[PDB]
């Protein structure tokens, strides 16, 4: 696309600048360009891709939730009719969010996942796939909602199976996957008990492996463990 004429290394360099500038839409466009060069991504480059799109979609999700809350108050008893505008604007934001999710899913399908053989890369991309189907599920209503939820579940489950076989229980990628799959269970799949069990099991298995870690790896792992604990505290 518009990045086709820019060097791969320059796209990555500019993604890093955009991050520093808090220009996340630019960051995401640079990283899309880098992916579309066709080469596999390094660990650092995967992280840049993730950060860029997570920030873009996160802003959209936050706006969607504000608009949805105004829309659902408009649809209460005793609410004055104010016309189509709230729905139309919610729809506009929703369609943009869906477009971003579709963009990310398209990068994963063409061709990041199929070229990813190492557990670090494959788990990362499958977790991403689950996340972006999860964001689609948050706004889905209507006939494909079940299928979207199933797509998220399937991606997460494939990532889980690989991570349990190939990574230690403290690996930050494995931990973040488990965190996000637990969120899926609680918030999307109407399975709070599964969410709680996964978070508990994950936390406890990681605890038991901390003794193997350097000081720096310990800090990395315990940061995510704390998030599992924060959700457990919220959910119980």
């Amino acid at each position: 696309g518009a990045m086709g004429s820019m060097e791969r290394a320059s796209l990555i360099q500019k993604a890093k600048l955009a991050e520093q500038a808090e220009r996340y839409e630019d960051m995401a466009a640079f990283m899309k360009g880098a992916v579309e060069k066709g080469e596999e991504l390094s660990c650092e480059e995967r992280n840049l891709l993730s950060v860029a799109y997570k920030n873009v979609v996160g802003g959209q999700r936050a706006a969607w939730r504000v608009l949805s809350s105004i829309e659902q108050k408009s649809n209460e008893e005793g609410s004055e009719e104010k016309g189509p505008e709230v729905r139309e604007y919610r729809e506009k934001v929703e369609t943009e969010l869906q477009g971003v999710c579709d963009t990310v899913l398209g990068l994963l399908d063409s061709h990041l996942i199929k070229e990813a053989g190492d557990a670090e890369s494959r788990v990362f991309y499958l977790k991403m796939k689950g996340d972006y189907y999860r964001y689609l599920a948050e706004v889905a209503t209507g006939d494909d909602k079940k299928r979207i939820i199933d797509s998220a579940r399937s991606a997460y489950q494939e990532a889980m199976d690989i991570s349990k076989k190939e990574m230690p229980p403290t690996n930050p990628i494995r931990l973040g996957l488990a965190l996000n799959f637990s969120v899926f269970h609680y918030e999307i799949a109407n399975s709070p008990e599964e969410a709680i069990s996964l978070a508990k099991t994950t936390f406890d298995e990681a605890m038991a492996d901390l003794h193997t870690l350097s000081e720096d790896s310990y800090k990395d792992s315990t940061l995510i463990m704390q998030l599992l604990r924060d959700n457990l505290t919220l959910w119980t």
Partner: peptide, 8 residues
């Protein structure tokens, strides 16, 4: 509160 997912 909404649940916390993995941060950047």
């Amino acid at each position: 509160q909404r649940s916390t997912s993995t941060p950047n």
